[PDB]
Structure formats: structure tokens, C-alpha cells
Amino acid sequence: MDEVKVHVGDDQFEEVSREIKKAGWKVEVHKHPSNTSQVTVTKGNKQWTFKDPKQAVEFVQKSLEHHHHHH
């Protein structure tokens, strides 16, 4: 699936939501009961995991916004 997702708590969700919305990609965000800072990107048979949204956005931007892959 070409769906991107982010799983973080309520304390860092606004920060992740702002960077993700600023990025413009279709991503699903879920708030955990405890403090969590991890982004999970699902693209086909690949998945990325990061501790910050900037890490995910910068890595996704370089891989997904700069590089392209054909099926």
C-alpha cells in the first residue's frame, strides 16, 4: 500500500500533524495513551520507522519526493 502513517501521542501529535500537513501527503495519524514519537511509512513492500516527523518527512521527501520507483 502507498499509505503513509504516523503514530504519536497527544503531546507530539500537533507537531507531527503540522509537519505532515505541511508535507501534503495522505498520511494516517493516531494518538497513543502514553508519550510516543514514532512515524511509520508504508509504501508497497517497504516501511519506514522514525523517532521524529522531520526525520520521516525529510527521509520520505528524499526517497518519495526526490526519488521514484516503478512497479
Side-chain angles (χ1 to χ4, degrees):
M1 285 65 180
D2 290 89
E3 290 180 270
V4 188
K5 293 163 177 180
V6 197
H7 264 255
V8 301
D10 290 75
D11 290 270
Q12 214 187 271
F13 161 89
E14 289 180 270
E15 198 84 90
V16 187
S17 58
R18 210 180 286 180
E19 276 172 76
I20 286 302
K21 283 180 180 180
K22 169 174 180 180
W25 359 303
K26 288 180 180 180
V27 204
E28 234 180 90
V29 192
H30 296 257
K31 282 167 264 180
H32 270 107
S34 300
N35 290 90
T36 41
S37 55
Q38 201 174 90
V39 198
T40 317
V41 191
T42 346
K43 209 92 187 177
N45 289 90
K46 289 196 179 180
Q47 200 184 90
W48 300 244
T49 334
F50 300 99
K51 288 200 182 287
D52 286 90
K54 210 182 180 73
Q55 259 180 270
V57 173
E58 286 280 90
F59 203 100
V60 176
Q61 274 187 270
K62 286 180 180 180
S63 58
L64 170 141
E65 287 201 65
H66 283 263
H67 288 102
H68 291 101
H69 290 101
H70 290 259
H71 291 101

Coordinates of all heavy atoms in Angstrom, one line a residue:
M1 N 0.8 -1.2 0.0 CA 0.0 0.0 0.0 C 0.9 1.3 0.0 O 1.9 1.3 0.6 CB -0.9 0.0 1.2 CG -2.1 -1.0 1.1 SD -1.6 -2.7 1.1 CE -3.2 -3.5 1.0
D2 N 0.4 2.3 -0.7 CA 1.1 3.6 -0.8 C 0.7 4.5 0.3 O 0.9 5.8 0.2 CB 0.9 4.2 -2.2 CG 1.6 3.4 -3.3 OD1 1.0 2.5 -3.9 OD2 2.7 3.8 -3.6
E3 N 0.1 4.0 1.4 CA -0.4 4.8 2.5 C 0.7 5.1 3.5 O 1.4 4.1 3.9 CB -1.5 4.0 3.2 CG -2.8 3.9 2.5 CD -3.9 3.2 3.2 OE1 -4.0 2.0 3.1 OE2 -4.6 3.8 4.0
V4 N 0.8 6.3 3.9 CA 1.8 6.7 4.9 C 1.1 6.9 6.2 O -0.1 7.3 6.2 CB 2.5 8.1 4.5 CG1 3.7 8.4 5.4 CG2 3.0 8.0 3.0
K5 N 1.7 6.5 7.3 CA 1.1 6.6 8.6 C 2.0 7.2 9.7 O 3.2 7.0 9.6 CB 0.5 5.3 9.1 CG -0.6 4.7 8.3 CD -0.9 3.3 8.5 CE -2.1 2.7 7.7 NZ -2.3 1.3 7.9
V6 N 1.4 7.8 10.7 CA 2.2 8.3 11.8 C 1.5 8.0 13.1 O 0.3 8.3 13.3 CB 2.4 9.9 11.8 CG1 3.6 10.3 12.7 CG2 2.7 10.4 10.4
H7 N 2.2 7.4 14.0 CA 1.7 7.0 15.3 C 2.5 7.7 16.4 O 3.6 7.4 16.8 CB 1.8 5.5 15.5 CG 0.5 4.8 15.1 ND1 -0.4 4.3 16.1 CD2 0.0 4.5 13.9 CE1 -1.4 3.7 15.4 NE2 -1.2 3.8 14.1
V8 N 1.8 8.8 17.0 CA 2.5 9.5 18.1 C 1.4 9.9 19.2 O 0.2 10.0 18.9 CB 3.3 10.8 17.6 CG1 4.4 10.4 16.7 CG2 2.3 11.9 17.0
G9 N 1.9 10.3 20.4 CA 0.9 10.7 21.4 C 0.4 12.1 21.2 O 0.8 12.8 20.3
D10 N -0.5 12.5 22.1 CA -1.2 13.8 22.1 C -0.3 15.0 22.3 O -0.6 16.1 21.8 CB -2.3 13.9 23.1 CG -3.5 13.0 22.8 OD1 -3.4 11.7 23.0 OD2 -4.6 13.5 22.4
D11 N 0.8 14.8 23.0 CA 1.8 15.9 23.2 C 2.7 16.2 22.0 O 3.1 17.4 21.9 CB 2.7 15.5 24.4 CG 2.0 15.4 25.7 OD1 2.0 16.5 26.4 OD2 1.5 14.4 26.1
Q12 N 2.9 15.2 21.1 CA 3.7 15.5 19.9 C 2.9 15.4 18.6 O 3.4 15.6 17.5 CB 4.9 14.5 19.9 CG 6.2 15.1 19.3 CD 7.3 14.0 19.1 OE1 8.1 13.8 20.0 NE2 7.3 13.4 17.9
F13 N 1.6 15.0 18.8 CA 0.7 14.9 17.6 C 0.5 16.2 16.8 O 0.5 16.1 15.6 CB -0.6 14.3 18.1 CG -1.8 14.5 17.2 CD1 -2.1 13.5 16.2 CD2 -2.7 15.6 17.3 CE1 -3.2 13.7 15.4 CE2 -3.7 15.7 16.5 CZ -4.0 14.8 15.5
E14 N 0.4 17.3 17.5 CA 0.2 18.6 16.9 C 1.4 19.0 16.0 O 1.3 19.5 15.0 CB -0.1 19.7 17.9 CG -1.5 19.6 18.5 CD -1.7 20.7 19.5 OE1 -1.4 20.5 20.7 OE2 -2.2 21.8 19.1
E15 N 2.6 18.6 16.6 CA 3.9 18.9 15.9 C 4.0 18.0 14.6 O 4.4 18.5 13.6 CB 5.1 18.6 16.8 CG 6.4 19.3 16.4 CD 6.5 20.8 16.8 OE1 7.0 21.0 17.9 OE2 6.0 21.6 16.0
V16 N 3.6 16.7 14.8 CA 3.7 15.8 13.7 C 2.6 16.1 12.6 O 2.9 16.0 11.4 CB 3.5 14.3 14.1 CG1 3.7 13.4 13.0 CG2 4.5 14.0 15.3
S17 N 1.4 16.5 13.1 CA 0.3 16.8 12.3 C 0.6 18.1 11.4 O 0.2 18.1 10.2 CB -1.0 17.1 13.1 OG -0.8 18.1 14.0
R18 N 1.3 19.0 12.0 CA 1.7 20.3 11.3 C 2.7 20.0 10.2 O 2.6 20.5 9.1 CB 2.2 21.3 12.3 CG 2.0 22.7 11.9 CD 2.5 23.7 12.9 NE 1.7 23.8 14.2 CZ 2.0 24.5 15.2 NH1 3.0 25.4 15.3 NH2 1.2 24.5 16.3
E19 N 3.8 19.2 10.5 CA 4.8 18.8 9.6 C 4.3 17.9 8.4 O 4.7 18.1 7.3 CB 6.0 18.1 10.3 CG 7.0 19.1 10.9 CD 8.0 18.4 11.8 OE1 8.9 17.8 11.2 OE2 7.9 18.4 13.0
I20 N 3.4 17.0 8.8 CA 2.8 16.1 7.8 C 1.8 16.9 6.9 O 1.8 16.7 5.6 CB 2.0 15.0 8.6 CG1 3.0 14.0 9.2 CG2 0.9 14.3 7.7 CD1 3.9 13.3 8.2
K21 N 1.0 17.8 7.4 CA 0.1 18.6 6.7 C 0.9 19.6 5.8 O 0.5 19.9 4.6 CB -0.9 19.4 7.6 CG -2.0 18.5 8.1 CD -2.9 19.4 9.0 CE -4.0 18.5 9.6 NZ -4.9 19.3 10.5
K22 N 2.0 20.0 6.3 CA 2.9 20.9 5.6 C 3.6 20.2 4.4 O 4.0 20.8 3.4 CB 4.0 21.5 6.5 CG 5.1 22.2 5.9 CD 6.1 22.8 6.9 CE 7.2 23.5 6.3 NZ 8.1 24.2 7.3
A23 N 3.7 18.8 4.6 CA 4.3 18.0 3.6 C 3.3 17.6 2.4 O 3.7 17.4 1.3 CB 4.8 16.7 4.2
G24 N 2.0 17.7 2.8 CA 0.9 17.5 1.8 C 0.6 16.0 1.4 O -0.1 15.8 0.4
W25 N 1.2 15.0 2.1 CA 0.9 13.6 1.7 C -0.2 13.0 2.5 O -0.5 13.4 3.6 CB 2.1 12.7 1.7 CG 3.4 13.2 2.1 CD1 4.1 14.3 1.5 CD2 4.3 12.7 3.2 NE1 5.3 14.5 2.2 CE2 5.4 13.5 3.2 CE3 4.2 11.7 4.1 CZ2 6.5 13.3 4.1 CZ3 5.2 11.5 5.0 CH2 6.3 12.3 5.0
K26 N -0.9 12.0 1.9 CA -2.0 11.3 2.5 C -1.4 10.3 3.6 O -1.0 9.2 3.3 CB -2.9 10.5 1.5 CG -3.7 11.4 0.7 CD -4.6 10.6 -0.3 CE -5.4 11.5 -1.2 NZ -6.2 10.7 -2.2
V27 N -1.5 10.8 4.8 CA -1.0 10.0 6.0 C -2.0 9.9 7.1 O -2.8 10.8 7.3 CB 0.3 10.8 6.6 CG1 1.2 9.8 7.4 CG2 1.1 11.5 5.6
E28 N -2.0 8.8 7.8 CA -2.9 8.5 8.9 C -2.2 8.7 10.2 O -1.1 8.1 10.4 CB -3.5 7.1 8.8 CG -5.0 7.1 8.8 CD -5.6 5.7 8.7 OE1 -5.8 5.0 9.7 OE2 -5.8 5.2 7.6
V29 N -2.8 9.4 11.1 CA -2.1 9.7 12.4 C -3.0 9.3 13.5 O -4.2 9.5 13.5 CB -1.9 11.3 12.5 CG1 -1.0 11.5 13.7 CG2 -1.2 11.9 11.3
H30 N -2.4 8.6 14.5 CA -3.1 8.0 15.6 C -2.4 8.4 16.9 O -1.2 8.3 17.0 CB -3.2 6.5 15.5 CG -4.1 6.0 14.4 ND1 -5.4 5.6 14.5 CD2 -3.8 6.0 13.1 CE1 -5.9 5.3 13.3 NE2 -4.9 5.5 12.4
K31 N -3.2 8.9 17.9 CA -2.6 9.3 19.2 C -2.6 8.2 20.2 O -3.7 7.6 20.4 CB -3.4 10.5 19.7 CG -3.0 11.9 19.1 CD -4.1 12.9 19.4 CE -5.1 13.1 18.3 NZ -6.1 14.2 18.6
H32 N -1.5 7.9 20.8 CA -1.3 6.8 21.8 C -1.6 7.4 23.2 O -1.4 8.6 23.4 CB 0.1 6.2 21.7 CG 0.2 5.0 20.8 ND1 0.8 5.1 19.6 CD2 -0.3 3.8 20.9 CE1 0.7 3.9 19.0 NE2 0.1 3.1 19.8
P33 N -2.0 6.5 24.2 CA -2.3 7.0 25.6 C -1.0 7.5 26.3 O -1.1 8.5 27.1 CB -2.8 5.7 26.3 CG -3.2 4.8 25.2 CD -2.3 5.1 24.1
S34 N 0.1 7.0 26.0 CA 1.4 7.4 26.5 C 2.2 8.3 25.5 O 1.8 8.4 24.4 CB 2.2 6.2 26.9 OG 1.6 5.4 27.9
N35 N 3.3 8.9 26.0 CA 4.1 9.7 25.1 C 4.9 8.9 24.1 O 5.8 8.2 24.5 CB 5.1 10.6 26.0 CG 4.3 11.6 26.8 OD1 3.9 11.4 27.9 ND2 4.2 12.8 26.2
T36 N 4.5 9.0 22.8 CA 5.2 8.3 21.7 C 5.6 9.2 20.6 O 4.9 10.1 20.2 CB 4.3 7.2 21.2 OG1 2.9 7.7 21.1 CG2 4.4 5.9 22.0
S37 N 6.8 9.0 20.1 CA 7.3 9.8 19.0 C 7.9 8.9 17.9 O 9.2 8.7 17.9 CB 8.4 10.8 19.5 OG 9.4 10.2 20.2
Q38 N 7.1 8.3 17.1 CA 7.5 7.4 16.0 C 6.6 7.5 14.8 O 5.3 7.4 14.9 CB 7.5 5.9 16.5 CG 8.4 5.0 15.7 CD 8.5 3.6 16.4 OE1 7.7 2.7 16.1 NE2 9.5 3.5 17.2
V39 N 7.2 7.6 13.6 CA 6.5 7.7 12.3 C 6.7 6.4 11.5 O 7.8 6.0 11.4 CB 7.0 8.9 11.5 CG1 6.0 9.3 10.4 CG2 7.3 10.1 12.3
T40 N 5.6 5.8 11.0 CA 5.7 4.6 10.2 C 5.2 4.9 8.8 O 4.0 5.2 8.6 CB 4.9 3.5 10.9 OG1 5.1 3.5 12.3 CG2 5.3 2.1 10.3
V41 N 6.0 4.7 7.8 CA 5.7 4.9 6.4 C 5.5 3.6 5.7 O 6.4 2.8 5.7 CB 6.7 5.8 5.7 CG1 6.2 6.2 4.3 CG2 7.1 7.0 6.5
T42 N 4.3 3.3 5.1 CA 4.1 2.1 4.4 C 3.9 2.4 2.9 O 3.0 3.2 2.5 CB 2.8 1.4 4.9 OG1 2.4 2.0 6.2 CG2 3.0 -0.1 5.0
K43 N 4.8 1.9 2.2 CA 4.8 2.1 0.7 C 5.2 0.8 0.0 O 6.4 0.4 -0.1 CB 5.8 3.2 0.4 CG 5.5 4.0 -0.9 CD 4.6 5.2 -0.6 CE 4.1 5.9 -1.9 NZ 3.2 7.0 -1.6
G44 N 4.2 0.1 -0.5 CA 4.4 -1.2 -1.1 C 4.8 -2.3 -0.2 O 4.2 -2.6 0.8
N45 N 6.0 -2.8 -0.5 CA 6.7 -3.8 0.4 C 7.7 -3.2 1.3 O 8.5 -3.9 1.9 CB 7.3 -4.9 -0.5 CG 6.3 -5.8 -1.2 OD1 5.9 -5.5 -2.3 ND2 5.9 -6.9 -0.6
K46 N 7.7 -1.9 1.5 CA 8.6 -1.1 2.3 C 7.9 -0.4 3.4 O 6.8 0.0 3.2 CB 9.5 -0.2 1.5 CG 10.5 -0.8 0.5 CD 11.5 0.2 0.0 CE 12.5 -0.5 -0.9 NZ 13.5 0.5 -1.3
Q47 N 8.6 -0.2 4.5 CA 8.1 0.5 5.7 C 9.2 1.2 6.4 O 10.3 0.6 6.6 CB 7.3 -0.4 6.6 CG 6.4 0.2 7.6 CD 5.7 -0.7 8.5 OE1 6.2 -1.0 9.6 NE2 4.6 -1.3 8.1
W48 N 9.0 2.5 6.7 CA 10.0 3.3 7.4 C 9.6 3.6 8.8 O 8.4 3.9 9.1 CB 10.2 4.6 6.7 CG 10.8 4.5 5.3 CD1 12.0 5.0 4.8 CD2 10.1 4.0 4.1 NE1 12.1 4.8 3.5 CE2 11.0 4.2 3.0 CE3 8.8 3.4 3.9 CZ2 10.6 3.8 1.7 CZ3 8.5 3.0 2.6 CH2 9.4 3.2 1.5
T49 N 10.5 3.7 9.8 CA 10.3 4.0 11.2 C 11.2 5.1 11.6 O 12.4 5.0 11.5 CB 10.4 2.7 12.1 OG1 10.2 1.5 11.3 CG2 9.5 2.8 13.2
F50 N 10.6 6.1 12.3 CA 11.5 7.3 12.8 C 11.0 7.7 14.1 O 9.9 7.5 14.5 CB 11.4 8.4 11.8 CG 11.9 8.1 10.4 CD1 11.1 7.8 9.4 CD2 13.3 8.0 10.1 CE1 11.5 7.5 8.1 CE2 13.8 7.7 8.9 CZ 12.9 7.4 7.9
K51 N 11.9 8.5 14.8 CA 11.6 9.0 16.2 C 11.0 10.4 16.1 O 10.4 10.8 17.1 CB 12.8 9.0 17.0 CG 13.3 7.7 17.5 CD 14.2 7.8 18.7 CE 14.8 6.4 19.1 NZ 13.7 5.6 19.8
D52 N 11.1 11.1 15.0 CA 10.6 12.4 14.8 C 9.9 12.6 13.4 O 10.3 11.9 12.5 CB 11.7 13.5 14.9 CG 12.1 13.7 16.4 OD1 13.0 13.0 16.8 OD2 11.5 14.5 17.1
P53 N 8.9 13.5 13.3 CA 8.2 13.6 12.0 C 9.1 14.2 10.9 O 8.9 14.0 9.7 CB 7.1 14.6 12.3 CG 7.6 15.4 13.4 CD 8.4 14.4 14.3
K54 N 10.1 15.0 11.3 CA 11.1 15.7 10.5 C 12.0 14.7 9.8 O 12.4 14.9 8.7 CB 11.8 16.8 11.2 CG 12.3 18.0 10.4 CD 13.1 19.0 11.1 CE 13.5 20.2 10.3 NZ 12.4 21.1 10.0
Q55 N 12.3 13.7 10.6 CA 13.1 12.6 10.2 C 12.4 11.8 9.1 O 13.0 11.4 8.1 CB 13.4 11.7 11.4 CG 14.8 12.0 12.0 CD 15.0 11.1 13.3 OE1 14.7 11.5 14.4 NE2 15.6 9.9 13.1
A56 N 11.1 11.6 9.4 CA 10.2 10.9 8.4 C 10.0 11.7 7.2 O 10.1 11.2 6.1 CB 9.0 10.5 9.1
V57 N 9.7 13.0 7.4 CA 9.3 13.9 6.3 C 10.6 14.1 5.4 O 10.5 14.1 4.2 CB 8.8 15.3 6.8 CG1 8.6 16.3 5.7 CG2 7.4 15.1 7.5
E58 N 11.7 14.4 6.0 CA 13.0 14.6 5.3 C 13.4 13.3 4.6 O 13.9 13.4 3.4 CB 14.1 15.1 6.2 CG 14.0 16.5 6.6 CD 14.4 17.5 5.6 OE1 13.6 17.9 4.8 OE2 15.6 17.9 5.6
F59 N 13.3 12.2 5.2 CA 13.6 10.9 4.6 C 12.6 10.5 3.5 O 13.0 10.0 2.4 CB 13.7 9.8 5.6 CG 14.6 8.6 5.2 CD1 15.9 8.5 5.7 CD2 14.1 7.6 4.4 CE1 16.7 7.4 5.3 CE2 14.8 6.5 4.0 CZ 16.1 6.4 4.5
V60 N 11.3 10.7 3.7 CA 10.3 10.5 2.7 C 10.4 11.4 1.6 O 10.2 11.0 0.4 CB 8.8 10.5 3.3 CG1 7.8 10.3 2.3 CG2 8.6 9.5 4.4
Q61 N 10.8 12.7 1.8 CA 10.9 13.7 0.8 C 12.0 13.4 -0.1 O 11.9 13.6 -1.4 CB 11.2 15.1 1.4 CG 9.9 15.8 1.8 CD 10.2 17.2 2.3 OE1 10.4 17.5 3.5 NE2 10.2 18.2 1.3
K62 N 13.1 12.9 0.4 CA 14.3 12.5 -0.4 C 14.0 11.2 -1.2 O 14.4 11.1 -2.4 CB 15.5 12.3 0.5 CG 16.1 13.5 1.1 CD 17.3 13.2 2.0 CE 17.9 14.5 2.5 NZ 19.1 14.3 3.4
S63 N 13.4 10.2 -0.6 CA 13.1 9.0 -1.2 C 11.8 9.0 -2.0 O 11.8 8.5 -3.2 CB 12.9 7.9 -0.1 OG 11.9 8.2 0.8
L64 N 10.8 9.6 -1.5 CA 9.5 9.7 -2.2 C 9.2 11.0 -3.0 O 8.6 11.0 -4.1 CB 8.3 9.5 -1.1 CG 6.9 9.8 -1.6 CD1 6.0 8.7 -0.9 CD2 6.5 11.2 -1.1
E65 N 9.8 12.2 -2.5 CA 9.6 13.4 -3.3 C 10.7 13.7 -4.2 O 10.6 14.5 -5.2 CB 9.4 14.6 -2.3 CG 8.0 14.7 -1.7 CD 7.6 16.1 -1.2 OE1 7.5 17.0 -2.0 OE2 7.5 16.2 0.0
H66 N 11.9 13.0 -4.1 CA 13.0 13.2 -5.0 C 13.3 12.0 -5.8 O 13.5 12.1 -7.0 CB 14.3 13.5 -4.2 CG 14.3 14.9 -3.7 ND1 15.0 15.9 -4.3 CD2 13.8 15.5 -2.6 CE1 14.9 17.1 -3.7 NE2 14.1 16.8 -2.6
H67 N 13.1 10.8 -5.2 CA 13.3 9.5 -6.0 C 12.0 8.9 -6.3 O 11.0 9.1 -5.6 CB 14.2 8.5 -5.1 CG 15.6 8.9 -5.0 ND1 16.1 9.5 -3.9 CD2 16.6 8.8 -5.9 CE1 17.4 9.7 -4.1 NE2 17.8 9.3 -5.3
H68 N 12.0 8.2 -7.5 CA 10.8 7.5 -7.9 C 11.1 6.0 -8.2 O 12.2 5.7 -8.7 CB 10.3 8.2 -9.2 CG 9.7 9.5 -9.0 ND1 10.4 10.7 -9.2 CD2 8.5 9.9 -8.5 CE1 9.6 11.7 -8.9 NE2 8.5 11.3 -8.5
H69 N 10.1 5.2 -8.0 CA 10.2 3.7 -8.2 C 9.0 3.2 -9.0 O 7.8 3.5 -8.7 CB 10.2 3.0 -6.8 CG 11.5 3.2 -6.1 ND1 11.6 4.1 -5.0 CD2 12.7 2.7 -6.2 CE1 12.8 4.1 -4.5 NE2 13.5 3.2 -5.2
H70 N 9.3 2.4 -10.0 CA 8.3 1.9 -10.9 C 8.0 0.4 -10.6 O 8.9 -0.3 -10.2 CB 8.8 2.0 -12.4 CG 8.8 3.4 -12.9 ND1 7.8 3.9 -13.7 CD2 9.7 4.4 -12.8 CE1 8.1 5.1 -14.0 NE2 9.2 5.4 -13.5
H71 N 6.8 0.0 -10.7 CA 6.3 -1.4 -10.5 C 6.2 -2.2 -11.7 O 7.0 -3.2 -11.8 CB 5.0 -1.4 -9.7 CG 5.1 -0.8 -8.3 ND1 4.7 0.4 -8.0 CD2 5.5 -1.4 -7.2 CE1 4.9 0.6 -6.7 NE2 5.4 -0.5 -6.2

